[PDB]
Every structure is written in C-alpha cells, then in structure tokens.
Design a protein around this ligand. Structure first.
Ligand SMILES: Nc1ncnc2c1ncn2[C@H]1[C@H](O)[C@H](O)[C@@H](CCO)[C@H]1F
Ligand SMILES: Nc1ncnc2c1ncn2[C@H]1[C@H](O)[C@H](O)[C@@H](CCO)[C@H]1F
Ligand SMILES: Nc1ncnc2c1ncn2[C@H]1[C@H](O)[C@H](O)[C@@H](CCO)[C@H]1F
Ligand SMILES: [Zn+2]
Ligand SMILES: [Zn+2]
Ligand SMILES: [Zn+2]
Lengths: 421, 421, 421
C-alpha cells in the first residue's frame, strides 16, 4: 500500500507531496545520493495516478520513452523510441540487458513477446510491432486511444496532437515544468524546490544569478543597445544540462477550448489536474466535429506566490538590467502582509525575511527583498494619485512597472491562439 | 446517516456548512486535491435538501443536466441535454460508459430502461423518452410538475419560466451564485470562500485585482474618456474559465411577486431559502390566474458584510479608477466597530486587520482597509453638516460617495421589472 | 409537556421567552435555518396561552387564516380565508394536500368532516360550512363568540370589531407588532430582536439606515422643501417584504375605554397582556349598552428603553435630516446612568457602548450614541435656565428637541379617538 520514493527521511517536500497526492501513502526510502531526486518522486506518483484513473485493458502510446521504465508494469504500452539524442543508445542497450536478465526468471509479464518483438525490429528496421518501433511521433502508424508525454519539450503541440487525433486517440496527458514564466517573457529564472536553474544564452557571463560564471578584472575605459530575450535557453537540473527553444515551450500553453480543423476536425479542451511548485499535469480530451465557440484565454491558478522583478547585474564587465522570476512559499507571503503596508528599505526586508526563514533557499532572498521593496513603493504611489470615476484624461502618459507579484489564491490570464488549421 | 463531502478535515468552511444545513451530519472525506472543492459540498447538500423536501413519486425535469449525477438516485428524472458547449460530448460518453459498466451488476435501479431509452434516442434523434432527450429548454414537450436549475446562467429567466409553467410545472428551484454584485453594477469582484474571481473584459490588463496580468515597462510620454461596465464578463472558479453576460445574470434577480401574462396567465413568487457566502438557493412557485397587485422591489438580507469601494489601478500602463466589491466575515465587522468611531488612516486599519486576522484571505485586506478608512471619514463629514428637519434647500448640490458598506443584519432593496408579457 | 421551538441552543432570546411566558417550560429544537425564526416562537406560545385561558367547547373565528396551522388542534375553529393575496393559492393547496395525506391514518381529529366541508365549498362557492368559507371579515355570517387576529394589518379596527359585535362575539385577541413607533410619526425604524426593518418610501435610497441602497458618485453642481412622512411604508422581516399603510396601523392603537354606537350600541375595553421587545398581545372585551364616560387616552408601559432621534443622511446624493426610532435593552440603559450626568461626545459614548456590549446588534450603536450625547446636553441646558414657580412669561419662544428617550419603568400617553359611529 505505501509508495516508496527516493528521498531523505527528514525532507520538507514530503508534506508537499502529501498535499499534492492525497490518495497514496508515501514513505521515504533513500538509496542513492541523487542531487535532483525531488523530480523523480513527483513523476513517480504521476504515472500511478494516471494508471489508477484510466480504464483497464487499453493500449497506451508513449512518445519519446525509455522502455526500461515500462517493463515491469501490467498494461499494454507501445513505446515510440527514435534515435535523435546522444543518450538513446545506452537506453536501448539497458533495455536489452534487462530483457536478457529475465528470460525465464519472471514469467508473469510478457517478456518473451517483448524479446521477440525487439529481435524482429532488429531484423527489419521498418516493422511496427505491438510494443516497439523506430519512428517519430508523426510517423508511427500504431492506432491507439491514449497517449502520454513525459518531459517532452521539443515537439510542436498542435501538430503532434493532430497526428494522434486521426488515429483514434481521445485522451492525452502531459507532465512537466510550468510554462507560465515563458509567457511573461523573462530572461532567467529558477525552480528552487527541484534544484533547477534556467537562463538565456546572452546572460551566461553574469555574476549573481543561479547559472553563470565570470572573471576577475580591474576595469578598462574602452554596437548593441538591444538586450532582449532570444530563442535559445539553457536548463540545468541538478548537474544535467538541456538546451531548449522558447517557441516550443510556449506552444504547450494551450487555452481551455480550441479547434483542430484540417482534413478531419476536432474540438479539444485543456485542464490542469495536478500542480506542485513548478510541475504540472495536463489532461487533454479530443472529439470530432466543430462544437461551440472559443474565447482564446489561458488561465493559471497560483497556490504559491509568483514574482518577476527587474535587477541590475554585470555581464562580461558591462552593467545592465533585466528581469528575473521566481516562486515564493505561501506562508512567507502571508506573514509579510503587515510589513508591506508601509514603505520599507531592501535591507530591512532582507533582515525580516532572514528572521522568518530553512523554508526557502537562501540564495534567492536578496532579490525577493528588492522586489517586495519596489512593490510597496508603487502601491503607495498609486494610492496618492487618485483619479475620477469612469474618465480617462488624454496622448496619455505611462507609468513605471518594476515588479509583478501574483499572491496565492489569484489567477493569471493571457491571450493565445485558438484556431489551428 | 452522515453525509461525506470532499473537504479536508481541518477546514473552516465545515462549520459554515453546519450553520447553513442544520439537518444533516457532515463528515470530511478527502479523495482528490481539487482546488475549487468547496462548491461541490454545497451543491451536494442542496440536492439532498430539495429531495428531502419534495413529495415522493414525482417526475422532475433537469435543465442542462449531466446524466451521470442522476444515475444512482431513486427518483424519476428527465434530463434535457442539448449539445451547445464543448464539454457535452465527454459528458455523454461518460454517461454511456457508466451505463455499460453496470449492465447487470446493479438491478435496484432502472438501468435497463435507461440503456434502452439512450439507444432509442441514438436511433431516431427526435424522440421524447421518459428519461432523456436532445432538445432545448423551450422545445422539450415532456410534461412534468417540478423543474431544477443547477449552475445555469445562459437562459433568460422569464421566458424559461413561462415555457415551463404551461406544461404543468408548479414549483422550480435555482442554485447558484448571488446576483447582488451585478445589481450594483460593479467592475470586478471576488467570492473568496470558493476561490472564484470575476472581472470585466476591459480591465483584464490591470495589476492588483484578483484576475489580471501585466508587463514590466519604463514609461513612455505618448479617444476614450469612457470607462464603464460592458456586457461581457469573465469568471474563474479555481482554474476553470466561464464567459458570461450581464443581462442574463441580472434577469434572475426576481421580485417577490410578479405576473407572467401571455396567452395563459400566471402569478409567481420568489423566495430565498439557503444562503452561504455567495451561493443561494431560490424557490419559485407558480399558479394560474392574475391575482393581486405587485410592487416591484427585490430584497436581499445580509448575514455577512458586503463592501463596494473605489480604487485606483494601472491598466496597460494608464492610471485609472473603478469599483470593486467583496464579502467580509461577520466577526471582523463586529470587532471593527470601536475603531471606526474616529478617522483612521489606511495603514493603521491594515495593521489592525492583520492583527485580528486565517479567517479571511490576505490578498483582499489592503482594499478592505481603504474602504473602511474612506467610510469612517464620510460618516464624520455627515456628522458636521447638520440640517433642519423636513426641509430641503434648493438646483441642489450632490456629495461624494466612494464606499458602500452593508453591515450584517441589514437589507438591500432595488427596483426591478414585475410585468412580463 | 415541554414546548419545542425552532431556535438555536445558545440563544439569548430564550431567557426573554421565559420572562415573557412564566407558565411554560421551553426547550430549543433546531430544524431549519430560518433567518426570521424568533417571531415564530412568540406566535407559537401566544396561541397556547390563548387556548389555555379560554373556556373549552367554544367556537373560534379566524380572520385571514392559514388552515394548515389549525388542522391538528382539538378546538372548533372556523377559518375565514378570502383570496386577496398572491400567497393564498399555495396555502389552499397545502391545506388540501395535508387533508389528503391523513384520510384514515389519523382519526382522532375531524378530518372527514373537514374534507367534506372543503369539497362542498369547492362545489358551491357561496356556502357557509362550519369550518371554512370564502368571505371577508365583514361578509361572513357564521355566528360565534371568540375572534382571533394573527399578523393582520390591512383591516380598519373599529369597523371590523363592530361587524363581529353584532354576531355574539364578546372577546377578541390581537397579536402583532407594537404600534407605538407610528404614534410618534417616525420616518424609519427597526425591531432588532426579530431581524426586522421598516422604512418610509421616500428614503429608500438613503445610505446608513437598515433598509436602503445607494450608488457611487463624484458630485454634481446641479421643487421640494417638504420631507414629511407619507402613507406607504415598507417592512422587511428577515428577507420577506410587506407593504403597509400608516392609517390602518394607527387604527389599532385603541384607548382603554371606547364606545361603538351605530344601530346597536357596545362599550369596549382594550388591555395589553403580553409584551416582548416589539411583539404585543391585546385582549378586547365587548358588552351591549352604552355604559359610563370615556377619556380618550392610550397608555404604553416601557419595560425597555425607547429612543427617537434626529439624524443626517444622504438620500440620492442630497443631504437631509429625519427621525429614526429604536429599542434599547434595560441593562445597558441602567449601566449608562452614571455617564449621562455630564456632557459627553459621541465618540466617548460609542467607545463606552462597545465596551459594555453581544447584547445588542452592532449596526444600531452609532445612532444610539448620538441620541444619548444630544439628550445629555439638553438636560444640562434645561438645568441652567431655571424659572419661577407657577408663572409663564409671555408670543412665547420654543426650544429645540432632538431626542426623545423613554427609560424603563415609564409610560407614554397619547390622545386618540373614543367615539365611533
Ligand atoms: N519528433 C520526435 N518524436 C518523438 N520523439 C522525439 C522526437 N524528438 C525527440 N524525441 C525524443 C528524444 O529522442 C528524447 O529521447 C525524448 C525526450 C523525453 O525524455 C524525446 F524528446
Ligand atoms: N437554451 C438552453 N436550454 C437548455 N440548456 C442549455 C441551453 N443553453 C445551454 N444549455 C446547457 C449547456 O449545454 C450547458 O451544458 C449547461 C450549463 C449548466 O451546467 C447548460 F447551460
Ligand atoms: N378584508 C379582509 N378580511 C379578511 N381577511 C383579509 C382581508 N384582507 C386581507 N385579508 C387576509 C389576506 O387574504 C391575508 O392572507 C391575511 C394576512 C394575515 O396573515 C389577511 F390579511
Ligand atoms: Zn510504432
Ligand atoms: Zn425531453
Ligand atoms: Zn364563514
């Protein structure tokens, strides 16, 4: 009955897992000293929840899979395993090793069939076996009714979803990182509960962000003028590095209702079912035919505080300014309500935050204090420039905005595309 | 005997549930981590109350129903299920699945008849079966005596009620959100006990309201003049989005006595039986014949504090002012009586509110403090401009009103339409 | 033996109920969450007292009755049920259903006779059956000796009483609200122990009275001169609305002795037997013949404090002043004796009242404090303008009066009509 996860006994993330999954029993059982082990415990319970809420005796597609994970299970998967990354060959060899190491020791599974299918694929590399193939997502012809995505970021969501819509798939799941920081178009950020930092390529030589490296210098006295976000972004999960693109990340921020109308037509809905400090599980349902109208709005609910603030740093010796975003626990946000009524200095806020705090990591405190200090001043400036009801005075002047703060129990709303052809 | 609801064990809404339903035993039994789970516990007890106060062996219509909810019951429903929203095909598929999954396992119900009726409707899509149809509310011809509305907002109340009265229906129920904030014509608002925020479309790019998103900017130096509420409004319940219209929302704020006089004539009454921090249950009775006179007044009783105040914000860079409304618990209102005798500053009120408060959510405190501070000053200004009894001095000057505060144990009264033809 | 009433266990009105009815033992038994449930508990024991003090084997008329209340009793009633209100058909339908639901289950009653009488009335709608009719109070010809009025406000008392005087009735009862506030000609008022507020029609758009609604505004720079009470008044009991007229309310404030002399002559007396914070029971005795002389004075005894004060408010943007009346508990009045010796400001009075107070509802405190502060100043002004014994100095000047305060153990006396022809 209890589910064993690879976390230390006295870890504060266990209660977060409890609140996120209040239908399983969780017990810590540490084996290896993995430095990014919190993500595995979430993706570990996510698949169990999906299987516990899916109908039995159904065929399940798997886009970009590792077949060793789906070998000791009891459902009929079909693994789509192309060779496009440098880390695939050892995955295939590992699958082969564990297939050979249980030839007759385990018989409750379909090991013999899997071995035969793998040998058939090795023989002719164009066959479509029940449980394995060497195609991409838009070329596999194995018909099914369920599709699952796990840490898949390099596919374009509309085209991918449309290419399983025409194959009898009526339900899809997507587990991954929150897409919200890239809808706000920030330059760098962190997911401090999973030891993950991401940064744009043009700020890799900064000084005081979570992913950078600089040098010592004395200061020289010897065109650009445009410092704006670009497509290429670098992710660091623990010590593992992943390059990503902004367009494909943004393409998965789907509205509540949309239409896929090419040759065959479908009406699709997107809902968020599980959310934990950066990880989200999204369920998508599809049905043929053009049903009612679409608005084009995407909504995000905030259970914790979300901050995005301006900061000044030194990149390769040159002083510049750009935006950084982060997550803040709800308890600290609730306990900071009284102080933010007045105007406070960044160092006083820093001392107060250190006094209250460990609940949050210490390397993010100095920027949170500055964001709070700048927010409290803009609130006061808004309060002292009262206007009249229902009238605008006008060319009209615009004001400064250096902080965006989303408190818990609030919602963000953005305009996106809803008509895909 | 105890009713099991999907809420956490230590939830403060439980005692409010008892205060609202003092005829059932309530026990918390958490299953899923739903972020808007408080609505289900209210709509869950409401149906039991309706059934426990309705005569047995009666046929019940259901406008805009989900047949899966009324499958394991023991009363004769008739579900009107048109296909007008994108989420209807999944409801029909789920109904089919739960009908097929209990073919012979359960026999206490009318499962065989329901399956046969569904197959008959699938055969000819114009039939009128005892328990199911594919018609609109004004086109179904199944005669009955009771009608129920659940979270129905897109119908015009007089026409819908008139098309139900000519079919033998003498009693109707309506469960939903309070219509009072739209009678005051507010711009945005919240229902903080159910994690719901609503806003007008023209203020979606604000900064500090509960449903908005903005950007960072420096400030540019580069017609409108009319900022007034419009028809289209957006609702967010947890993370689910609903577009609504102001006219159809206001159409359900019915007076105590009204007349429906077309070809046949009816006299109708409207009464409120259950109210809980935003949810209301309304009972409507109808009788043939034009009986006595009508006044045209609608009355709302306040068990908790209601506030509507002016505020200044920045929308898309431009500084503007508009009105926001909210609900306040009764205990805080009672404990703030002494302080409001004198003139107080917003920050002192903020600190006092933080000291007393969690009972209320923290993101609404700063606007409540400002509303209280502005109300206390207008009271003092009224006290120092004493007039004479029974005489008006006159063109007459109007005064400023920036806050409307309805304390508990008070009533609001509005003028509405009472003659419908 | 115990009388079960629908109130919460820990309610302060219970001890007042015992103080008012020290011949019954009362136990609270909550079933429904009625928001105006206190008046039902008073009207419930009122009928018990009336029946326990009336001779057995007597016929009782019932003016404007609901026959469902008098169905499971053991005395011979005769219900006068005209069809003048929009809520009467539902009462008749409920009576029919309750008669049909006990055809043979209960036989201790006269159910068969009642059913037969109802069927006979439905057959010919001019018959006069022992227990039912479709006439008014001045058209029923069923002779009796006792009449009862319950929450009847739309009849003119002299004509009504005369039309049962000529029919052998020698004793009548009247249960309802206190008529005293309308003899003082106030503009608005409250009955805070029963969650009831009433207002004149010309002040429905005020701001801080208990029954009003206003809007937000900025203030414009753009005949009347007469703001006086009018006939039409609106009552709100919980959330139920009732319109009444001032004349018919005042007509029930009867003197201690009066004469009804038309064709036959009668001498009548009026006495108050039960009084509780706004609800009164009046007993009227009638006798043939013109007996001794009349004075024409009506007296009211105050067991609690009664206040009437001037106040300044804003109606539809215009600043005006008018009078408001209310009831105050005796304990607070007794504990305020020491403070009122000197001249006090409204702020100090408000703070003291909050300190002593919950015993009284918080929304009425600010006007009570102002009334006390204004009364204390007029007392001192009277004290410092001493006159000579038995001499008036005179045209004579009039002084200001802004507060009327009737302390407990005092009596009000008014001049009314006593000769009715
Ligand atoms: N067009 C594609 N169709 C299917 N799978 C694809 C595609 N491109 C890359 N992949 C896989 C890669 O081989 C990685 O292994 C997987 C990363 C998840 O862990 C996944 F991204
Ligand atoms: N004119 C209509 N007559 C009957 N039902 C209608 C109508 N319009 C929409 N609906 C239904 C929709 O299909 C949604 O499912 C229901 C929402 C409640 O949950 C309900 F609104
Ligand atoms: N002239 C009348 N003679 C007798 N009854 C009358 C008369 N006018 C109205 N009524 C009744 C109405 O029908 C309401 O039901 C009753 C309200 C008390 O609850 C009562 F007011
Ligand atoms: Zn394949
Ligand atoms: Zn139908
Ligand atoms: Zn009669």
């Amino acid at each position: 009955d209890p589910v064993y996860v690879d976390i230390d006994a006295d870890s504060a993330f266990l209660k977060a897992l409890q609140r996120a999954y209040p239908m399983f029993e969780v017990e810590p059982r540490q084996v290896t000293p993995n430095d990014h082990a919190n993500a595995r415990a979430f993706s570990h319970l996510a698949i169990k929840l999906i299987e516990q809420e899916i109908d039995p005796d159904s065929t399940i597609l798997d886009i970009g899979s590792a077949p060793a994970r789906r070998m000791m299970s009891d459902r009929k998967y079909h693994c789509v395993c192309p060779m496009r990354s440098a880390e695939d060959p050892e995955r295939l060899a590992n699958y082969a090793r564990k297939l050979a190491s249980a030839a007759g020791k385990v018989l409750d599974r379909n090991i013999s069939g899997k071995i035969g299918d793998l040998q058939a694929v090795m023989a002719v590399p164009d066959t479509e076996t029940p449980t394995f193939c060497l195609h991409t997502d838009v070329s596999c012809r194995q018909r099914a009714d369920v599709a699952i995505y796990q840490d898949v970021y390099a596919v374009h969501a509309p085209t991918s979803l449309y290419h399983q819509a025409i194959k009898g798939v009526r339900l899809a799941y997507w587990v991954g990182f929150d897409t919200t920081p890239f809808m706000y178009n920030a330059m760098a950020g962190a997911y401090p509960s999973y030891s993950t930092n991401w940064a744009d390529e043009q700020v890799l030589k900064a000084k005081n962000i979570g992913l950078c490296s600089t040098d010592l210098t004395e200061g020289r006295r010897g065109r650009g003028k445009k410092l704006e976000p670009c497509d290429r972004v670098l992710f660091s999960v623990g010590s593992t590095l992943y390059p990503e693109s902004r367009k494909l990340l943004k393409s998965w921020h789907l509205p509540s209702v949309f239409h896929l109308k090419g040759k065959l037509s479908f009406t699709c809905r997107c809902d968020t079912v599980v959310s934990c400090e950066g990880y989200v599980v999204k369920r998508i349902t599809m049905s043929p035919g053009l049903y009612g109208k679409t608005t084009g709005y995407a909504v995000t609910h905030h259970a914790d505080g979300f901050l995005m603030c301006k900061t000044t740093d030194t990149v390769d010796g040159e002083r510049v300014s750009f935006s950084v975003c982060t997550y803040v626990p709800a308890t600290i946000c609730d306990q900071m309500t009284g102080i933010l009524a007045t105007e406070v200095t960044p160092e006083d806020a820093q001392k107060l935050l250190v006094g209250l705090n460990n609940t949050m990591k210490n390397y993010m405190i100095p920027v949170v204090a500055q964001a709070f200090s700048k927010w409290a001043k803009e609130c006061r400036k808004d309060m002292e420039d009262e206007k009249l009801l229902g009238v605008r005075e006008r060319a009209f002047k615009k004001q400064k905005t250096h902080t965006v703060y989303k408190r818990p129990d609030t919602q963000s709303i953005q305009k996106v595309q809803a008509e895909f052809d």
